[PDB]
Design goal:
heterotetramer, A mainly alpha (about 290), B mainly beta (about 325), C alpha/beta (about 230), D mainly alpha (about 55), A: about 290 residues, mainly alpha, about 80% helix, C: alpha/beta, Rossmann fold, 6 strands, binds the ligand CN[C@@H]1CCc2c(ccc(O)c2O)[C@H]1O, membrane (chain D), host-virus interaction (chain D), methylation (chain D), acetylation (chain D)
């Protein structure tokens, strides 16, 4: 009803405010202090920048679209907003994958890790991640390689008052793979190996100091790291692949709901990747 | 031993009788300097590991710093440039000095050898001029009397005066029970004082070679030492939070600088050009500025991620540079 | 004028040299060979070699750098060894009945307690080498001074349920070795908070595989530090 | 033995000295600080034009 629209608007405003505040706080904390300038913190700030871009561009305009039920802006603006959304999502997820791989190299090969990760190498990795994200988003959308040959889709592409997402099978499959499924399997293997390392270290410590008093923590941390990423994004890409195949019809409302559930991962990310005592001290110093 | 106890009792009685009124009473009417706001004008970057010691050049522009990476870097403070970067034979370095003539730089540490580098050589950019050896402990601090003499303070509980050209100890000073951790020369260079781990600061006469006065003060070790600009008083830093000022003529403590919140140690002490401010580093990550005549804190210097290990005030009193364990040199004003 | 250009060129050259030096420095680890006198530190140092004493050895294409310092009970220079990979502690485990006045083993335990509780040496793991195992075995096996005479707690001591012995050993020598190890381990366990651990090893002059033990201990140290940094341990 | 005699002689050397009253010393330090406070860039804020680092 009328109250429902106001409630949805309030929820969207709270979500965008939380995302913007958290990401800008993380970026300011990393930039202001030279202590926080660390090789892994470059990946962290790349993730924060991607999440801030998404929460500033895709979230507000998408909320305006869902509340207004039509696209007031031009046809070029629809394509640009879609490109920015896809670019931000891909960059964020691939940066999560890169952080996972960095941790894999940190624990798995501690001696060689300090030598083959450097500031220049980190910058090259971040630039490569953003270029890969851009090619998946801007190149197909801007040159209209994602447009599908459907009657409803063709009608939607004509009228400038409607800005929805209708995509061909090939582009949707490739984008879903590159954005989520390759990072998913890479992060799964990485975190499985890291959990194995932590477990074997725990048994080694227990063997060394069994008589004296001195994997709950590892399991809890890996759950808080992987579950919040899997639970947020997995349903969206699952239903993406499902409706693209069209074998099981998916309503547009369900698609939008799962997409926004994926969107809130940008807000959830700083609460997972910025719990370090140095980051907490920096946040306390910055705010009161 | 009985005579020594009587002599010590007589010295203590004479010091107590000489104490008419404490410095706090006399400086009561002096207007406080008020709060002092100071910010990092320039940050010097390039050091690999923690920085221990630094020394401002006589030109008030060039400063030399030492780190555990084995690099002895000479910075141009005005332009934030690296004039020189001297490698070192031993990675572990705990001291450095810059000659008054601006031509020589001294270094030392756990290597038990005082290394002196000639910056005026043209065939080679930097090279070892002398390998001053003879100490049996780590060199805590080295200072330059002139271009041809140097005084060092080692862990052998002895301070020695060296001759650069000949290359051996001209005179040695003994009397400290514990390791000597700091050394500062009087402006006239005829006298100097060296703090020791024995909770005692001693005054030495360079020409005579014999100790003159000894001040007890606190009970913890002394890590920092610095004369008053007048050359007639000095202030000490301790592992205990107390920072104390002594007087040569009164031969006893005048005022003590301590605070209830501070429980950490002091690693570096220096005076302002006019002597009104006593800048003292701390084992805590931040530095402090004390009013010398009133023992009231004026300003707090913060912005170092680790403990402050070096500190100095330039000759013209324009800037203060503190080198912490964060491998960064910050120049304040 | 040209002074600014000359300074810029000098800074650029020095910065390139410092970048190369930083790569070389971060590629190499540092250890402190700190132990009591006449405890076999020279023998173990010579085994690993294959005012201060610095020896550099590499294993598995990983560069290790060791420093042995040589002068009183007070140690203010110990703050210079913060942020080292590990501290190697060699002790004459056979010297449970000797004068160093005071028992040598007790003096070594006091030194270990001082090092473990040092503020600056926090988050620094200690690799423990119980040197001179053969002499300890010869002493305990033969009829001689009992451990309980010098260490009262040995009478109530019992063999731990782990009971991991060598291929061939006696119950008495195993009890003595494990009691000596557990004294150090009990000193190490209480004060630690998971940042730094103590790695004990029973070594002798005949053994020459201590390079592998040091390499494995350093690998475990860095792995545990990385795991605790990310809060997975 | 011999160290005790050296320590006693050293204490005797330090004992024989003239000490001026703490009032005079405090007055001297205060006078020096008051006289030289006019040329202390740290104590008083130097103008940005005359500041070399700024
Ligand atoms: C307009 N919403 C888009 C539609 C499809 C899509 C998204 C995000 C990442 C991708 O790889 C996609 O293919 C969604 O944000």
């Amino acid at each position: 009803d009328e109250v429902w629209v106001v409630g949805m608007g309030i929820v969207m405003s709270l979500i965008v405010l939380a995302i913007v505040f958290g990401n800008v706080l993380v970026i300011t904390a990393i930039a202001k202090f030279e202590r926080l300038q660390t090789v892994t913190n470059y990946f962290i700030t790349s993730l924060a920048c991607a999440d801030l871009v998404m929460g500033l561009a895709v979230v507000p305009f998408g909320a305006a679209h869902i509340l207004t039920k039509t696209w007031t802006f031009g046809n070029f603006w629809c394509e640009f907003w879609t490109s920015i959304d896809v670019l931000c999502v891909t960059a964020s997820i691939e940066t999560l994958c890169v952080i996972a791989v960095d941790r894999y190299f940190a624990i798995t090969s501690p001696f060689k890790y300090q030598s083959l990760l450097t500031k220049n190498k980190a910058r090259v990795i971040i630039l490569m991640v953003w270029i890969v994200s851009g090619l998946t988003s801007f190149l197909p959308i801007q040159m209209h390689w994602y447009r599908a040959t459907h009657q409803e889709a063709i009608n939607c592409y004509a009228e400038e008052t409607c800005c929805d997402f209708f995509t061909n099978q090939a582009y949707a499959i490739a984008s879903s793979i590159v954005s989520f499924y390759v990072p998913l399997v890479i992060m799964v293997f990485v975190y499985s190996r890291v959990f194995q390392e932590a477990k074997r270290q725990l048994q080694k410590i227990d063997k060394s100091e069994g008589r004296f008093h001195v994997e709950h923590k590892a399991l809890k941390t890996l759950g808080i790291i992987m579950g919040t990423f899997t639970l947020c994004w997995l349903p969206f890409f699952i239903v993406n692949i499902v409706h693209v195949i069209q074998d099981n019809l998916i309503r547009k409302e369900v698609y939008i709901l799962l997409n926004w559930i994926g969107y809130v991962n940008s807000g959830f990310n700083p609460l997972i990747y910025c719990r370090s005592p140095d980051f907490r001290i920096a946040f306390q110093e910055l705010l009161c | 031993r009985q005579e020594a106890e009587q002599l010590k009792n007589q010295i203590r009685d004479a010091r107590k009788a000489c104490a008419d009124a404490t410095l706090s009473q006399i400086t009561n009417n002096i207007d406080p300097v008020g709060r002092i706001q100071m910010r990092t004008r320039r940050t010097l970057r390039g050091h690999l590991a923690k920085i221990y010691a630094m020394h401002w050049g006589t030109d008030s522009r060039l400063l030399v710093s030492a780190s555990q990476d084995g690099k002895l870097i000479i910075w141009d403070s005005y332009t934030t440039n690296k004039v020189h970067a001297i490698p070192l034979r031993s990675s572990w370095v705990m001291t450095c000095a810059y000659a008054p003539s601006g031509n020589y730089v001294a270094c030392g540490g756990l290597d038990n050898i005082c290394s002196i580098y000639n910056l005026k050589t043209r065939e080679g950019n930097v090279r070892v001029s002398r390998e001053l050896a003879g100490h049996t402990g780590y060199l805590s601090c080295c200072r330059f009397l002139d271009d041809n003499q140097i005084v060092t303070s080692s862990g052998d509980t002895t301070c020695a005066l060296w001759d650069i050209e000949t290359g051996q100890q001209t005179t040695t000073f003994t009397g400290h029970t514990g390791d000597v951790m700091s050394l500062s020369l009087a402006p006239d260079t005829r006298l100097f004082v060296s703090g020791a781990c024995d909770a005692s600061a001693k005054l030495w006469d360079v020409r005579e070679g014999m100790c003159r006065q000894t001040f007890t003060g606190h009970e913890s070790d002394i890590n920092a030492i610095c004369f008053f600009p007048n050359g007639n008083a000095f202030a000490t830093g301790s592992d205990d939070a107390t920072c104390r000022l002594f007087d040569l003529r009164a031969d006893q403590e005048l005022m003590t600088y301590s605070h209830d919140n501070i429980i950490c140690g002091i690693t570096s002490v220096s005076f302002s050009k006019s002597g009104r401010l006593l800048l003292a580093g701390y084992d805590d990550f931040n530095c402090n500025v004390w009013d010398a005549l009133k023992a009231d804190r004026a300003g707090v210097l913060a912005g170092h991620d680790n403990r402050v290990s070096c500190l100095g005030v330039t000759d013209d009193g324009m800037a203060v540079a503190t080198g912490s364990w964060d491998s960064f040199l910050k120049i304040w004003n | 004028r040209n002074e600014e250009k000359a300074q810029r060129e000098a800074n650029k050259k020095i910065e390139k040299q410092l970048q190369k030096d930083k790569q070389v420095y971060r590629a190499t680890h540092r250890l402190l060979l700190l132990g009591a006198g006449e405890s076999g530190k020279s023998t173990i140092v010579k085994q690993m070699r294959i005012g201060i004493f610095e020896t550099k050895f590499q294993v598995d294409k990983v560069n290790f750098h060791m420093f042995d310092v040589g002068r009183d009970e007070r140690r203010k220079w110990i703050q210079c060894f913060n942020d080292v990979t590990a501290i190697i502690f060699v002790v004459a485990s056979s010297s449970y009945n000797m004068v160093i006045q005071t028992n040598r083993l007790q003096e070594a335990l006091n030194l270990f307690k001082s090092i473990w509780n040092n503020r600056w040496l926090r988050t620094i793991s200690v690799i423990l080498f119980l040197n001179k195992q053969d002499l300890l075995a010869e002493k305990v096996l033969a009829g001689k001074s009992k451990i309980e005479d010098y260490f009262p707690e040995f009478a109530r001591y019992t063999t731990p349920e782990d009971a991991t012995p060598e291929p061939g050993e006696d119950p008495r020598v195993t009890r003595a070795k494990y009691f000596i190890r557990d004294e150090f381990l009990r000193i190490s366990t209480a004060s630690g908070d998971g940042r730094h651990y103590c790695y004990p090893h029973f070594t002798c002059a005949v053994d020459t595989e201590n390079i592998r033990r040091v390499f494995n201990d350093c690998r475990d140290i860095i792995q545990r530090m990385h795991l605790r940094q990310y809060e997975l341990l | 033995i011999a160290q005790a005699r050296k320590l006693v002689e050293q204490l005797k050397m330090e004992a024989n000295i003239d000490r001026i009253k703490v009032s005079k010393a405090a007055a001297d330090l205060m006078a020096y600080c008051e006289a030289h406070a006019k040329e202390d860039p740290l104590l008083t804020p130097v103008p940005a034009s005359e500041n070399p680092f700024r």
